[PDB]
Amino acid sequence: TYKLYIMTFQNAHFGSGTLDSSKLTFSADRIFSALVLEALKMGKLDAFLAEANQDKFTLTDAFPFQFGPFLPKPIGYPKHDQIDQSVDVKEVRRQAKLSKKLQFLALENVDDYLNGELFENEEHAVIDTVTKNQPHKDDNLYQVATTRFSNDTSLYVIANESDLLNELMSSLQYSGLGGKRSSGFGRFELDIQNIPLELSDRLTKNHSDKVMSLTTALPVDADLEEAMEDGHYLLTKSSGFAFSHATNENYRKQDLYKFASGSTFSKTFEGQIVDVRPLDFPHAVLNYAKPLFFKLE
């Protein structure tokens, strides 16, 4: 809940299921996976997993950072009583579509956005696929989609600062994120920065009124029913092949459906770090899904 870890990339690839897909942002599980993997070669895995299972530990989906932090569009808002002007239908529907298109507010604007003021997206990057080849057949020809960052747009994450985490992130900035990292993408420059009060004021992990989740997260089996009934969410599917040195073969980890940031619920829930390993796999395969929230009004 402590600092803004601001990664600034030029080239990155954040595959949304295919090598010819790419995204502006990545989620908590991806960088958690990446952190785990860096700890493991540094020696310090056991110690990092120590830190991760602390309630104090906080990780959030990455977000746009452009001369200041952005946040996810609160899913579910604005409500009906704040959104129904007297204007003609063509306008209502244009701005309704403008509201669906919207991804990330700047912090400054989030309360406005909730109160009914209209915003549209900004250009944080351009994504394009390029085709590469391997000169041994016409059977290797492929496209990789990269996110190319523009307009002084970094990504950031909120995390709780610790000596170890700081070390792991500093090392990660030469390992890259997502991506075909070996092959050119993902590297970044890190800047750990104080968190503006205007935001940190509104962060909780326990709260019994309406909140938006900042992390793509899965409630504990006990809290789930409640968060789904009075919730407003988009379910995203975490899937992929578990990266590991355990075995030559590649096994799909277990598909996991989580609530996207920021889905919004009537109250905070406790989240999990899920073990999604293939059944009977040598080691745990960890999907980080533990929410940090943002309060509303």
Partner: protein
């Protein structure tokens, strides 16, 4: 053996269709003409247009209509026929609708074997650029080439491109090369490059045969007109028509 080896996608959409279905009959009278029946009949009009008549616009063209409806039309084919299909479809749609409704479309251009997902996605982006104008536009091969449908049809497709075609189908390799210069100069519009434009234009005029010397005089000065307008519309259309032409001849 003429023409670029690419296949194209088109995605096109009725404009503010939702708004039409719900309140398009409210303007005239004062909403007395907004009934359920009226709207039903509207729905049938668009079903008919998009699910029956659409196939006829496709006839004799090398392409396939994968999705078709007032909501969304998706068609993939060879490129010249896809642009012909889009244009035939639209102008039929404007007449059918009596000018009271429009389409936006975008048209993707890809090398053989690019996957379906990719084309659909990139052409969807192009269509949204097109909806990005005042929603009457068409976007072809790049978000930069985005024109009100009306003036792409009237101006790019069957004026500038016909003029270009006419002069350059007469020219030899050496002259056809100047198209590249013209392209460049269009991308680098600045004061001094107006000078350079004039120079290579008269150079071309020199290399052109005496049969077309008179027509080409007219054309050359018209071009420099487009390039000199403080309004950039005509030189944009110029860039895109020169492109169409080059794709059109390439071996």
């Amino acid at each position: 053996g003429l023409g670029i080896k690419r296949l194209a996608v088109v995605r096109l959409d009725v404009d503010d269709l939702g708004a039409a279905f719900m309140a398009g009959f409210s303007q005239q009278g004062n909403g007395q003409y907004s009934t359920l029946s009226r709207s039903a009949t509207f729905s049938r009009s668009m079903s008919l247009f998009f699910k029956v008549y659409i196939n006829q616009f496709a006839s004799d063209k090398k392409l396939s209509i994968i999705y078709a409806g007032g909501d969304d039309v998706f068609a993939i084919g060879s490129w010249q026929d896809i642009i012909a299909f889009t244009v035939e479809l639209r102008e039929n749609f404007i007449k059918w609708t009596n000018g009271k409704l429009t389409l936006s479309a975008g048209i993707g251009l890809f090398a053989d074997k690019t996957p379906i997902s990719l084309m659909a996605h990139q052409t969807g982006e192009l269509e949204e650029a097109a909806k990005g104008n005042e929603k009457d536009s068409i976007s072809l091969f790049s978000s930069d080439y985005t024109f009100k449908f009306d003036r792409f049809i009237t101006n790019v497709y069957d004026d500038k491109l016909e003029q270009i075609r006419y002069f350059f189908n007469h020219q030899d390799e050496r002259g056809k090369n100047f198209i590249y210069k013209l392209i460049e100069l269009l991308r680098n519009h600045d004061r001094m490059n107006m000078a350079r434009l004039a120079y290579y234009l008269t150079r071309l005029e020199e290399l052109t045969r005496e049969t077309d010397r008179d027509k080409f005089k007219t054309f050359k000065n018209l071009f420099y007109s487009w390039y000199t307008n403080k309004n950039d519309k005509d030189r944009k259309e110029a860039e895109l028509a020169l492109l169409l032409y080059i794709y059109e001849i390439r071996k």
